[model samples]
Target chain A: NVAHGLAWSYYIGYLRLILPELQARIRTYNQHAVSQRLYILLPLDCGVPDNLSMADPNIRFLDKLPQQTADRAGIKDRVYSNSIYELLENGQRAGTCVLEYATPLQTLFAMSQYSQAGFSREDRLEQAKLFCRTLEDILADAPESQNNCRLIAYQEPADDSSFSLSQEVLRHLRQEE
Target chain B: NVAHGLAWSYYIGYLRLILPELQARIRTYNQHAVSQRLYILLPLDCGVPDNLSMADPNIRFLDKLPQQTADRAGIKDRVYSNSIYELLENGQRAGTCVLEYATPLQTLFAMSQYSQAGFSREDRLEQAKLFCRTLEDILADAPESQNNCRLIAYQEPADDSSFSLSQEVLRHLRQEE
Candidate 1:
């Protein structure tokens, strides 16, 4: 089946030659990783930039979900995203970006999961689109925040489970290209 | 059996819901991804960093074996790494790091493989030590370049046989936690 025995032999053969120890350690770690989880806010609420990367430390795209916005969407389901691989913009071996939007209310929709390895594709991507539409509507009402579309930095929640609002960092990397 | 069927179902299910078109496209790409090769230099040649994380873009670890390494040690053989899941940072869903070493020739060691995904475990944590040991030597032999470790942007070669090196956008949310 190429999944088991046959392949293992080739790998072990090589490792046996060089790092026999790593061979076992790596196997144990891979076969059973610890419990991990992922928490994400659909950009339907925030105005996520067109580009994003995982290499960056924090993502600002996850802004507060308005009562109306939150009520209208399934932003909280937090299912398997089926995104087992990379996020989206989002290419292979890429990272997830969380940009902060200029929404007035400060309460953010925080998420927690089993691990980062897996995610649900829907509800989220659908939610991601919502923000762009939100931005469009914002432009019509048109304010300074919406006028210039540049994310500040990684914003942490000031309180427990709440979205943090503040200026951010110039990490080695930026989310959007 | 479980690995093949279970993981496969999850992957295909997602594709079917999103882009049925992509399902066929993805199947073709994956089944054929085997022949493409990646030629990387073990970081020992360039001197990898102390605080290494999977979230980082390139991986610069795994040392050398003079006298053709393998005939003596085990550095030349570029096997599957079987990291179909993620790179070995033990971090978030982030993938593995592939370092491009610092050798005078610049690019020489290329590799061919039977398959990618699966691998076998050797003895234990021994594999992890090989990389660190290599780094130790780099410092011992110590060069000025070894002092600073800044990975460059993706580089793509103009060829039909190689994988595209110039990285594009982010995929989803992942590593470097």
Candidate 2:
């Protein structure tokens, strides 16, 4: 999980590094305009936090701006009000944060490059194969643990309705298999 | 879940549709190439199957190709020999296949859009909020009696070595909160 977390952080940090200029431009446009809206796409699954009110005062902690720009725009109030922590704590996150970003016209190119970068498709396919092997290993060892204490039935049988639901889940799993 | 599945299928199907053409174009430039190495990129978390050998014959079941191409390219054998039952039985048949398809460039656009798109963004964001609320309702009030469990243990007891691996996870989640 540490590795996974590191990978995600690196990916996000790299994107941040590559697009600082664009981010600045967005901030510049957002300040003077009554409605500053720029439709930029992101390539990761970073969920938009809840309580992300555009009018909040805590967002400044997530990203800081240059002193000149901050002073000129008089954005201190707005910047501090809309913080990420507040949004996350409130469970008001948006789903768009999880998807790979794309504009209407450049979608294909974006998709292509995404497919070409990071872990290549072939490597992923190989990893999937390894996962299957690991599953097989687990199944092989299941018999040995069949008599473990955890397998003992200590509780009463479930009601018919509960049984039916369990059966439905089992059926679905089998069908999918 | 169905909508997500359909979206995933469409996304992958689109890629599959384009991949062969790309491969053909690449092959054309390497007509005398005898090696079978091919490269492709996939999401960070994606894992490919282990039984996928370049010399397998079961690959045809995964995708259909023109008779001429299949015969000329000798891909059928590769598919068959490398195909793993577990992937066919469990993986491809899973509910949805999410692909990491966004690049940094697209991510920038998404970030911009978070502030842009005005009414459209608001509408979409509202829809997402409502959808989540609806899902919570389904989970909490469904006729089926399910264990709607909440996290009880914050962190393992200090001296519990068995759960030591969870320490970092607990720390991270706490930090995020």
Candidate 3:
């Protein structure tokens, strides 16, 4: 059986005014290994782990799932990859969330958003460090399986995301044997 | 099959002090398992099959065996993982070759370096985009193994040569199961 872990942040121009929030979610297979797989269908036959937080009557995990929905007016626009797990703020879909985002490309896209917002020198350096701090906190608290710790993905503010990852950089980044 | 053990580092000011070299490597065994694996290993009792790289002089496949060497720096650093495949550059050893990379985190790390380089209000942004080209070429050229491919590693010029990879970035990098 294959386990799952997901972390998405709202550093993408959501609202710097709103307290920075970094959410890390993960689940592991305490059982047996299945045939090698790289992409599993969404809705993850396995309903997300109970650990995924949405209990805050205060904060609702927006239903960003792609479906027919009307715009501010009356017309509806088609959407895809409805599986996004976006965190909503004041009824607005801020930041990014991908259902099938295990690719370096998707990850880069996410980081790009983070960098875009952070690039503005307008934000305080202390504020910039805030998200990176949240990223660190999860690594320490996440569980360990296979002798290593949980694989945490992040979206820090003002980090990289300027250009494309390099060839020298791309050569690395592969599946473990 | 994928040889997974890999950890990527952020690009620090390794260049300003010494040389400015940018390199990237990746090995992905793409088939269909989406639950990400943080690490996988190689030298693979599964020798370099007949399909790996050949005809390249700068590259050589040394014996796929582990042995003794040095300490910290004296004895040549007795690297225990022992599974290092060298790529001679001007007859000097540099870079571990990346197969150990490609995750979104790593991809972002690679992108960060590109961004940092282009950030100087002093440099031309177009020059930074140039790096992105080489990256694109590899994805378009590198051998695809089993729908899979070779993982290559390298220690490029002036990278975070701190005793080890940066601590802030270290936690996210991992060894495979």
Candidates ranked by lDDT? 1, 2, 3
Cα displacement (angstroms), candidate 1, residue B64, comes to: 26
Q: Give one digit per residue, the lDDT tens place, for model 3 in B1-177.
A: 000101100111111111111111122222211112112112211112221223124334333222222221101122222122334455664333321222222222222233321222322223223223323333243232112222222222344543222211122222221
lDDT by residue for model 1 (B1-177), tens: 212222222222221122223223334446542111112223312222222323243322332111100110111111111111123232333332222322211111111122232222331123223323433333333233222222232333443564312121111112112
> What DockQ, on C-alphas, does every prediction get?
0.02, 0.01, 0.01
| Model 2 residue B39 lDDT score | 16
lDDT of 2 by residue, A1-177 (tens): 111212222223222232333334436534741111111221122211222222133211232222121110101111111111111222432111111111111222222334222333334323333323332333234332231101100111333322221222223223422
Ordered by TM-score, highest first, the candidates read 3, 2, 1
What's the distance in Å from true for residue A23, model 2?
Answer: 6.2
Q: Rate the local accuracy (lDDT) of all candidates.
A: 0.24, 0.23, 0.23
The DockQ assigned to candidate 1 is: 0.02
Off by over 4 Å in 2: A1-18, A21-177, B1-14, B31-177
Model 1, residue B55: distance off in Å is 27
